[PDB]
Amino acid sequence: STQREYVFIPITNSITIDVKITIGGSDHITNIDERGIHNVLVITGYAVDEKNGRLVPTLDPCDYVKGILVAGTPQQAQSNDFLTLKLPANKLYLIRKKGNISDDLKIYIPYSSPDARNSMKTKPVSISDDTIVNNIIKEVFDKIYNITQKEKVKIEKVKEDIKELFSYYALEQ
């Protein structure tokens, strides 16, 4: 059948080597149609590890980070430190639900061990530096979606929706 995997957008450039996938299938969970992002995933209870970016599972309901699922599996360098599960296609809190789900979907997750030796108090942070995502599209959003520079005539449109939508939490440690 099909499967997917998770990518995140921190205030860090820790997404360079994550997976070996560009398309995987032929159609995608998250879409690119001229009014910003679509089918964007929000996962609560996972906070980021900015340097060598990971996400630690906390015990917080409002500690939330957003991410994107595209068909593939990371690097064949995992299955010891990540997680992965196959949900019945509707266990996903994803903003701007547009396409009909496939009644099933397998998705991996970049996981971090709790590191139960530190007094971790997180902090939520907002995305800044319009340049940062204006070239994270150079990093992944064109690597994962070749559509960049080909369809969307309003680049700053997606720039500003990434400004306004995405904001997440950090371990700050």
Partner: protein, 304 residues
Amino acid sequence: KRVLIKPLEPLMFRSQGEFTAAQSLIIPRPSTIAGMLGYILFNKSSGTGDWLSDLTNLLATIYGTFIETNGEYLFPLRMGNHLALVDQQHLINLPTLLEKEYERREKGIYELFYDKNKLFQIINHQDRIGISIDKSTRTVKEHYLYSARYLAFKKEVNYVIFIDNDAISDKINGKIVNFGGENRIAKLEVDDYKVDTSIEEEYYLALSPILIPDEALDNFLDNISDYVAMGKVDKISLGFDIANTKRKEMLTAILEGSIVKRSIIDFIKNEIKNDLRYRFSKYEKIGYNTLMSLCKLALRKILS
């Protein structure tokens, strides 16, 4: 710090005209709480035709109202013509449930407003009819038959507010006050309580009516989905001023118990010139624009 208003008896918070009986609100408006507190702190020398100026001078920033039943905290939640009291443990997954799928949406929300609804376990609506008698005939004086639907409490209930200033929180302790409408009574008690402030989440709960400056009314309304996920928007009067014996004002407001999206904050922050900025800062000072996070008990004002 924290103020518990414990009604000694059924209460009456008259709303929406008097014209079977006149209905009572569930949660008293912040103007009522501010007016009771100013009634305590009053001095008959600061009079001015601006009721809210003389009221902001008498006290400090007051944070919105919710329900403490028996240690539990209940909070208002409305879907549109549907008020309910829920414990915050059912507000957690609410934003997830908001843009969740359709049939799951109705399943969850109607399970919340009906079975998880703790309103009727707490609140009874008690119609009271009174008359007036002329002291010589001993028969009902003509035209004096009034009715009102009081708000009776099945179990002991408190209204919870948070006040910033701690000086007044000394001469507020253990005061018996004339809380509400037709001469009903409640006791105030003050206790030190710890509450976070100003968290940057996406979905807040309007603990109090969020006012709208009557300038961005068309702006705020013609695209309503951008600011409130669920709740009610209504024109409300601001009450009745004791000094000049008139109604106060009428403003469109987001009724308490509504779910607001983070965007609303910036919106309100961009549509207020200095004049009405000061006006609505006073309004928030007496307690209108209070937000709480669906995460935990953490409050914040919109402007302040």
